[PDB]
């Protein structure tokens, strides 16, 4: 089995900037070499095969050269909608034997950045039919923001540490936004303890907070 | 031309599972192979092996799967993967693809028609179906002339489930969020949506296949 030693595990790149990928093969295969592209939660999809030539429907801007071990991959003209995570792959042996196989790269992921926004913050406070369950999940949304953002509960002022999960959305195809969702998840016992919820999403200096008061919802 | 891969499921440690891949559009030749690539949640792309269509062609399998997993094809439209021995390395959305050829006599070795994946959750527990609460501002916060609504599906397993709203009219400014995987092996997604406050109330439509789960949650903007 070869190995495909790919870099960089991610980059960021300015609209309209110029990127090169690189994949380097610790044994040596065949010209046979090829690029996808892959957004979250799809298949993925072959921008490049036999090294340079591109697959149907891949603009210029794409561009792929490379022999022996190492090969590039080149996006110029950047968009938004570039924006995923890029995979090499090779191939080695004989094609006419069942000895040889195919190798991916460990991926690169691609983040291109936009003018940079700070993102609108939504509490959801639980259901009624929530806390009935002895467990309650306050949601919460950061919406259209760049760059990353990180996210802190306080809990009447103490910041929370445990109970706590995140989800992003992919860059939005359009003015490269993220979108996040996080989760606090209590004990009833906690949550009718204690009276204001507090959302704090930061970027860097800056910082959006939401909040609630139990008894007012 | 089409691949749809079925039969991934939720099987205990030690089990073992098989998939299947379906071709539309075409039916299988001479002049390329039908492979398996498997992706952990959040890892990079795993080749596991291939057969070529026509079956006289060799079957070639990555080092680590030759003896555990084997492939086969079950007809002229059917590929089968057979997955002994199943550790929870194995859990993974498991892809099925065609090599693409630019000529009639063999592959290119790239490939470019991709099915959109089965999922194999290879866990010790039982399948629990999701529970789902309606998201929704505070009633105390005066309101606005557009909302932001939404559904919390907690506590599934296996993956996935679908989110869709009032039953797939409504798709602008949607946003379903990934799932995460608390510690206790079960997963958690919520998903919102942003419409104008015509007080008309929107309805979520989540479903999670594993347990034959369909619930339809109806979110008022909660003004009390």
């Known amino acids: 089995d070869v190995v495909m030693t790919q870099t960089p595990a991610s980059v960021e790149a300015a609209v309209g900037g110029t990127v090169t990928i690189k994949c380097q093969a610790s044994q040596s295969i065949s010209n046979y070499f090829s690029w996808y592209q892959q957004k979250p939660g799809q298949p993925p999809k072959l921008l490049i095969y036999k090294a340079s030539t591109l697959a149907s429907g891949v603009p210029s801007r794409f561009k792929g050269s490379g022999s022996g071990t190492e090969f590039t991959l080149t996006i110029s003209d950047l968009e938004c909608a570039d924006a995923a995570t890029y995979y090499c792959?090779?191939?080695?042996?004989?094609?006419?034997?069942?000895?040889?196989?195919?190798?991916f790269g460990g991926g690169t992921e691609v983040v291109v950045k936009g003018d940079p926004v700070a993102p609108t913050v939504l509490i959801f406070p639980p259901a009624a039919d929530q806390v009935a369950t002895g467990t309650v999940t306050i949601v919460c949304v950061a919406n259209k923001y760049f760059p990353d953002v990180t996210v802190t509960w306080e809990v009447d002022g103490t910041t929370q540490t445990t109970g706590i999960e995140n989800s992003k959305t992919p860059q939005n195809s359009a003015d490269c936004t993220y979108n996040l969702s996080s989760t606090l998840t209590l004990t009833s016992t906690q949550y009718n303890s204690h009276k204001e919820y507090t959302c704090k999403v930061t970027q860097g200096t800056t910082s959006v907070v939401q909040s609630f008061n139990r008894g007012d919802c | 031309q089409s691949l749809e891969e079925s039969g991934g499921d939720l099987v205990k440690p030690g089990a073992s599972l098989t998939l299947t891949c379906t071709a539309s559009?075409?039916?299988?030749?001479?002049?390329?192979?039908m492979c398996w690539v498997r992706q952990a949640p959040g890892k990079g792309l795993e080749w596991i092996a291939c057969i070529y269509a026509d079956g006289s062609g060799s079957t070639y399998y990555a080092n680590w799967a030759k003896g555990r997993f084997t492939i086969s094809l079950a007809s002229s439209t059917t590929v089968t993967l057979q997955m002994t021995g199943l550790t929870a390395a194995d859990t993974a959305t498991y892809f099925c693809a065609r090599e693409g050829a630019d000529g009639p006599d063999y592959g290119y070795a790239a490939f470019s028609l991709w099915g959109p994946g089965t999922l194999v959750t290879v866990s010790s527990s039982q399948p629990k179906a999701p529970s789902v609460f309606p998201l929704a501002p505070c009633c105390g916060d005066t309101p606005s002339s557009t909302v932001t609504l939404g559904c919390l599906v907690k506590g599934y397993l296996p993956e996935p489930v679908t989110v869709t709203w009032n039953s797939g009219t409504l798709t602008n400014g949607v946003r379903t969020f990934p799932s995460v995987r608390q510690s206790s092996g079960l997963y958690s997604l919520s998903s919102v949506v942003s419409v104008t406050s015509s007080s008309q109330p929107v309805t979520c439509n989540v479903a999670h296949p594993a347990t034959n789960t369909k619930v339809d949650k109806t979110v008022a903007p909660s003004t009390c």
């Open positions: 559009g075409f039916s299988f030749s001479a002049g390329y192979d």
């Open positions: 792959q090779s191939f080695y042996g004989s094609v006419t034997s069942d000895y040889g196989g195919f190798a």
